[PDB]
Amino acid sequence: SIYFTPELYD
Amino acid sequence: KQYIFQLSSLNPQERIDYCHLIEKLGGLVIEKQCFDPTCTHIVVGHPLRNEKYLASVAAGKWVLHRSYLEACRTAGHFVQEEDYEWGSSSILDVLTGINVQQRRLALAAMRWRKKIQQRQESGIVEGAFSGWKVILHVDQSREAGFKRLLQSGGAKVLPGHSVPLFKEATHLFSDLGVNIAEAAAQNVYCLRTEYIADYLMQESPPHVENYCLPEAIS
């Protein structure tokens, strides 16, 4: 989801 | 007891609904995009390798499934956390779609919560990265997130990446102007950022040699 904070990893 | 929440990996409507519930119940929510060490609990929709999740684990916070708050709503107060922790059988056994990364993340959350809370009552402050003195050379999109993560677990993040700092550093992490080979020549652990998460996710993480940056190899 666009509303979940992106991970710190690829 | 204090009930200071953050929220992570939830739909906006979930976040709004739960902010309202938590306040109604007498707790607080820290509504920030970033991790805030003042929090005591976090409700997570989906276990992920993001700043809030990893930093909460590094500091041994309660990492809780949303059904926690639904049980609170029914009870009319904050209930006992144990049966709603992501790493607990009550949650893990009932849920589907949990992949191996997520299961490890959930289990780690419970494990670190237990470990750290036994040291609190013993009167010592000590997160997962206690004793680490870290140089960060990571993508600018991500650096501040890693810094907060590392600090949450009790690491010192050193200012900058200048060679003079290498003698104070135990770890240098990168995911990419930094003289890495120089640090490696001084036995600083020169490692991929993945080590940080696997260090938390695993009971027995693999050897650091498995995460060596290119300039640090042999």
UniProtKB/Swiss-Prot annotation, chain A:
Q: Subcellular location, in the record's words? A: Nucleus; Cytoplasm
Q: In which tissues is it expressed?
A: Ubiquitously expressed, with highest levels in testis.
Q: How is it modified after translation?
A: Phosphorylated. Phosphorylation is necessary for interaction with BRCA1, and is cell-cycle regulated.
Q: Which family does it belong to?
A: Belongs to the DEAD box helicase family. DEAH subfamily.
**Domain text:** 4Fe-4S iron-sulfur-binding is required for helicase activity.
What is the annotated quaternary arrangement, including any partners?
Interacts with the replication protein A complex (RPA) via the RPA1 subunit; following DNA damage they colocalize in foci in the nucleus. Binds directly to the BRCT domains of BRCA1. Interacts with the CIA complex components CIAO1, CIAO2B and MMS19.
Q: What does this protein do?
A: DNA-dependent ATPase and 5'-3' DNA helicase required for the maintenance of chromosomal stability. Acts late in the Fanconi anemia pathway, after FANCD2 ubiquitination. Involved in the repair of DNA double-strand breaks by homologous recombination in a manner that depends on its association with BRCA1.
Task: Please report the name of this protein according to its UniProt entry.
Answer: Fanconi anemia group J protein
Give the organism, scientific name: Homo sapiens (Human)
Swiss-Prot record, chain B:
Q: What is this protein called?
A: DNA topoisomerase 2-binding protein 1
Q: What happens to this protein after translation, modification-wise?
A: Phosphorylated on serine and threonine residues in response to X-ray irradiation. Ubiquitinated and degraded by the proteasome. X-ray irradiation reduces ubiquitination. Deubiquitinated by USP13; leading to TOPBP1 stabilizion and activation of the ATR-TOPBP1 axis pathway.
Q: How does it assemble?
A: Interacts (via BRCT domains 1 and 2) with (phosphorylated) MDC1; promoting TOPBP1 recruitment to DNA damage sites during mitosis. Interacts (via BRCT domains 7 and 8) with (autophosphorylated) ATR; promoting activation of ATR. Interacts (via BRCT domains 7 and 8) with (phosphorylated) POLQ; specifically binds POLQ phosphorylated by PLK1, promoting POLQ recruitment to DNA damage sites. Interacts (via BRCT domains 1 and 2) with (phosphorylated) RAD9A. Interacts (via BRCT domain 2) with (phosphorylated) TP53BP1. Interacts (via BRCT domain 2) with (phosphorylated) HTATSF1.
Where is the BRCT domain positioned along the sequence? 1-86, 124-213
Residue window of the full protein shown = 1266 to 1491 of 1522
Annotated domain remarks = Some BRCT domains specifically recognize and bind phosphoserine/phosphothreonine marks on proteins. BRCT domains 1 and 2 bind phosphorylated MDC1 and RAD9A. BRCT domain 2 binds phosphorylated HTATSF1 and TP53BP1. BRCT domains 7 and 8 bind phosphorylated ATR, POLQ and RAD51.
Function text: Scaffold protein that acts as a key protein-protein adapter in DNA replication and DNA repair. Composed of multiple BRCT domains, which specifically recognize and bind phosphorylated proteins, bringing proteins together into functional combinations. Required for DNA replication initiation but not for the formation of pre-replicative complexes or the elongation stages. Necessary for the loading of replication factors onto chromatin, including GMNC, CDC45, DNA polymerases and components of the GINS complex.
Q: Which gene encodes it?
A: TOPBP1
Q: Which domain of life is it from?
A: Eukaryota
Q: Write out the similarity annotation.
A: Belongs to the TOPBP1 family.
Organism field: Homo sapiens (Human)
